[PDB]
């Protein structure tokens, strides 16, 4: 699929950085037109077949490919693309309250925080996995808050950049994101489906209940055969006034075998979080 090939500085005009990664960066723009605000999301295109740096065409394609798909109030969504011979621009819903990452270095939640976050995190990701979307990349570095001077902050899923549909209930392909969330059949390279994301969203609960990240070794590859010997406990200094029954939550997400454990809707209607 091709983009628009208009320069995109003759109709937005960019901002404030708001991140950047090994591919991408994301600058803060504004729509000429409508004066409506957006994040401009420059992803460096790969310019030889063979090559390692940029983005494959494919890759692009496939993540613009999800993001036309999801319209949902917990995942970023996708106004517009452009792109010239260096870049793929993805002009995409400005979220502008902070990583959710950066939200936790300032706080450890009391479980009504921890679940008021949480509780979105699962519509989001119900949504995408009722599409058949895993999302690979879940971390608190990828939740955006709307506005984080709020006692209750609204979220939204981000970075598409590892996301695949699931239409034959896996993807063997050699996905791979950041070892301290990965599930443990990323880490043995075995087929992956919408399970990996659940274990992830244990791995965030974890955090967002102890400040403490349960595999977390000295090195990747001590952080690696930690996930695939599922390799953690819930140290009683962090979590002593923590309830059993969310100690129990994330106990049947931190599963090695993908089919033992909770999908998406059993999460939603596990004791801890049904209303
Ligand atoms: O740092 C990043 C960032 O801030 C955002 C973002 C922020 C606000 C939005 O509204 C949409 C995206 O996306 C990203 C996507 C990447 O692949 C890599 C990044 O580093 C960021
Ligand atoms: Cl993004």
Same mark, same amino acid.
């Given at each position: 699929?091709?983009?628009?090939?208009?320069?995109?500085?003759?109709?937005?005009?960019?901002?404030?950085?708001?991140?950047?990664?090994?591919?991408?960066?994301?600058?803060?723009?504004?729509?000429?037109?409508?004066?409506?605000?957006?994040?401009?999301?420059?992803?460096?295109?790969?310019?030889?077949?063979?090559?390692?740096?940029?983005?494959?065409?494919? *890759?692009?394609?496939?993540?613009?490919?999800?993001?036309?798909?999801?319209?949902?109030?917990?995942?970023?969504? #996708?106004?517009?693309?452009?792109?010239?011979?260096?870049?793929?621009? #993805?002009?995409?819903?400005?979220?502008?309250?902070?990583?959710?990452?950066?939200?936790?270095?300032?706080?450890?939640?009391?479980?009504?925080? $921890?679940?008021?976050?949480?509780?979105?995190?699962?519509?989001?990701?119900?949504?995408?996995?009722?599409?058949?979307?895993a999302?690979?990349?879940?971390?608190?570095?990828?939740?955006?808050?709307?506005?984080?001077?709020?006692?209750?902050?609204?979220?939204?899923?981000?970075?598409?950049?590892?996301?695949?549909?699931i239409?034959?209930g896996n993807?063997?392909?050699?996905?791979?994101?950041?070892?301290?969330?990965?599930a443990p059949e990323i880490v043995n390279?075995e087929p992956l489906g919408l399970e990996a994301d659940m274990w992830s969203?244990g791995?965030?609960?974890?955090?967002?209940?102890?400040?403490?990240?349960?595999? #977390?070794?000295?090195?990747?590859?001590?952080?690696? $055969?930690?996930?695939? $010997?599922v390799?953690?406990?819930?140290? *009683?200094?962090?979590?002593?006034?923590?309830?059993?029954?969310?100690?129990?939550?994330?106990?049947?997400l931190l599963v090695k075998d993908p089919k033992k454990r909770m999908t998406?809707?059993?999460?939603?209607?596990?004791?801890?979080?049904?209303?």
């Amino acid at each position: 699929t091709v983009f628009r090939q208009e320069n995109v500085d003759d109709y937005y005009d960019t901002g404030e950085e708001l991140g950047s990664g090994q591919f991408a960066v994301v600058k803060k723009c504004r729509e000429k037109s409508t004066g409506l605000q957006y994040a401009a999301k420059f992803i460096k295109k790969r310019r030889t077949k063979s090559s390692r740096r940029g983005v494959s065409r494919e *890759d692009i394609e496939r993540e613009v490919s999800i993001l036309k798909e999801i319209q949902h109030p917990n995942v970023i969504t #996708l106004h517009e693309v452009y792109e010239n011979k260096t870049d793929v621009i #993805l002009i995409l819903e400005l979220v502008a309250g902070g990583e959710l990452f950066d939200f936790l270095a300032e706080k450890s939640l009391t479980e009504e925080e $921890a679940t008021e976050f949480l509780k979105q995190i699962l519509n989001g990701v119900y949504y995408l996995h009722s599409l058949q979307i895993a999302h690979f990349d879940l971390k608190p570095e990828n939740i955006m808050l709307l506005d984080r001077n709020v006692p209750k902050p609204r979220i939204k899923i981000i970075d598409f950049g590892l996301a695949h549909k699931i239409d034959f209930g896996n993807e063997f392909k050699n996905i791979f994101g950041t070892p301290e969330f990965v599930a443990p059949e990323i880490v043995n390279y075995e087929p992956l489906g919408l399970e990996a994301d659940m274990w992830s969203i244990g791995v965030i609960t974890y955090i967002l209940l102890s400040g403490a990240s349960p595999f #977390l070794g000295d090195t990747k590859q001590e952080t690696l $055969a930690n996930v695939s $010997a599922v390799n953690y406990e819930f140290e *009683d200094e962090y979590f002593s006034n923590t309830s059993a029954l969310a100690k129990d939550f994330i106990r049947r997400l931190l599963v090695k075998d993908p089919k033992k454990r909770m999908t998406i809707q059993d999460s939603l209607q596990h004791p801890w979080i049904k209303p």
